[PDB]
Design a protein around this ligand. Structure first.
Ligand SMILES: *C(=N)[C@H](C[C@@H]1CCNC1=O)NC(=O)[C@@H]1[C@@H]2[C@H](CN1C(=O)[C@@H](NC(=O)C(F)(F)F)C(C)(C)C)C2(C)C
Ligand SMILES: *C(=N)[C@H](C[C@@H]1CCNC1=O)NC(=O)[C@@H]1[C@@H]2[C@H](CN1C(=O)[C@@H](NC(=O)C(F)(F)F)C(C)(C)C)C2(C)C
Lengths: 305, 305
């Protein structure tokens, strides 16, 4: 028992982190087989980042202008190209620690682990969610760019995020590993802001099932609701609409606990309309929305990698 | 910017996890050089665990009764001994992935990362604190025993915890790596309960400094206080006494922000006496006490390993 915000073990990703320097700009890269992936603004000086022409800046660079360091070892760059907002640096050595991996683009509401890195060295690991407004609530400083987010399934690392920038209010934005931004953001130092965020309804429901499994049951009421009537109530409280797909992914937790999804919705509806009256759920005074249904099943069943 | 509950990168520890089976009992072990460390109740059947005589159970075991598996490879056990509540299994192969390490006994109030494992394979990593009542608020299932807690300092892993048992209310108890329990607990399946816990005052203060650094400043008031008068107020709210040693370890955060420790104490005093009135600090509606001062400096300064 117990329920914690849990990250994936980071070792498989640690073995892929490198340092990339171009000129005086340094950030992190991801070394998979004989390719290093990193944010393209490594080729910018401080003055270039407000209105960069990346194609022009890249045309002026040769392979040898990129200093790639894996630990205390320089990797020789033998090719380079740009794909959307990432650079791909071909190196003459394949990373022997390359895990089985794929590149995935995740959906808003899905969670992943971030391995925050500086100068190619890991600082820490934490779990976060792709918010409905396409930001993440991370913890990132200068030099953190190129840190990656990932999920693990058995032996396979699915990379889903590479870090590029910080938006107002201390939230973070980045790309998939093909260099395409999540959300409407661009890698330029300009006036950009995230849209209004929304609470991830299906994740709150998943976390309420986690609470029941841990014996924190006070919020269960005696009612049910229709999906439509729940969604009318949730809307006012800035919760996203609950879809039938969301209901379906809650199926395993509903079957395990015997609590119909729409019954849990009735209990959540009451929490939104009446508050928690100084009570906590799994130690939290606010409803938590950064556990997916699969996160709850993994943690409560002890899935390993 | 941003502030997250952050774990250490787990890779160095992942490389040390193994599976230990004796009879039909399986749990995790820690493989460092040519020794595997694991909880001694691996030698118990289900019926032995209520009133075990570990010395007697161990006398009946030979080296070959211990099946140690590192991945898909069996490690030959060539010696065995018991030290307090841990078994030490000498194996004929040294772990090539052994990091620089030490064994430390941590103090209540200090934090560490846990790599939760089952059958020698990692499930997840999370950050926790040794509570004043010598439990941790973890997430552990059947078969999790032998999972370890640790800190990292540059290249050196300080192992401080090995998991043994779950107490009422879903909190967890274990030993240092010399097999000595934290707290008054014994590795026997008997009626045991943790004492009343207390809030880790110095950690709450550290987290309030983290809030200031992130620009969440609303709670700063215009007053100071004496250490004695603060401790009188904190006592009623089940906060531990703040010592001069605690004041001293807050020094770096106090110097960085220019907020005297006793001034922050005056602000905390007001939060305890008046509540937060529906406000949050760093997104939390409750005061957080599982960041140490050094945790805050590490995260806000980007310390790497
Ligand atoms: C990459 N190492 C950093 C990571 C930042 C630094 C502070 N916290 C982070 O997460 N990325 C940048 O510095 C990028 C880089 C130029 C400017 N920038 C920003 O993150 C800036 N933000 C924006 O311009 C905004 F608001 F549009 F997102 C900054 C004001 C420095 C936080 C480029 C190319 C975006
Ligand atoms: C080790 N793999 C498990 C970990 C437990 C299982 C459920 N959650 C955990 O953290 N440890 C045990 O099963 C130990 C083992 C016998 C009994 N036990 C317990 O944790 C039990 N608790 C106690 O006996 C109590 F309350 F005293 F702590 C249990 C009721 C199964 C949770 C021994 C030798 C302590």
């Amino acid at each position: 028992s117990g329920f914690r915000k849990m990250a994936f073990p980071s070792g498989k990703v640690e073995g892929c982190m490198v340092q990339v320097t171009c000129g005086t700009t340094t950030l992190n890269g991801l070394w998979l087989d004989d390719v290093v992936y990193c944010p393209r603004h490594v080729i910018c000086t401080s003055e270039d980042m407000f209105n960069p022409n990346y194609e022009d800046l890249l045309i002026r660079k040769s392979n040898h202008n990129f200093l790639v360091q894996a630990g205390n070892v320089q990797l020789r760059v033998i090719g380079h190209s740009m794909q959307n907002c990432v650079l791909k640096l071909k190196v003459d050595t394949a990373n022997p620690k390359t895990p089985k991996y794929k590149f995935v683009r995740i959906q808003p509401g899905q969670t992943f682990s971030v391995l925050a890195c500086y100068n190619g060295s890991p600082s820490g690991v934490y779990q976060c969610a792709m918010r409905p407004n396409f930001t993440i609530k991370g913890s990132f400083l200068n030099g953190s760019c190129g840190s990656v987010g990932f999920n693990i399934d058995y032996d396979c690392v699915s990379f889903c995020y590479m870090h590029h920038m910080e938006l107002p209010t201390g939230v973070h934005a980045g790309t998939d590993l093909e260099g395409n931004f999540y959300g409407p953001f661009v890698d330029r130092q300009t006036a950009q802001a995230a849209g209004t965020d929304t609470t991830i309804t299906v994740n709150v429901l998943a976390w309420l099932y986690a609470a029941v499994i841990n014996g924190d049951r006070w919020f269960l009421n005696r009612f049910t609701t229709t999906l439509n009537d729940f969604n009318l109530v949730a809307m006012k409280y800035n919760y996203e609409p609950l879809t039938q797909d969301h209901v379906d992914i809650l199926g395993p937790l509903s079957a395990q606990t015997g609590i119909a999804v729409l019954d849990m919705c009735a209990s959540l509806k009451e929490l939104l309309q009446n508050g928690m009256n100084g009570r906590t759920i799994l130690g939290s005074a606010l409803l938590e929305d950064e556990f997916t249904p699969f996160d709850v099943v993994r943690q409560c069943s002890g899935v390993t990698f």
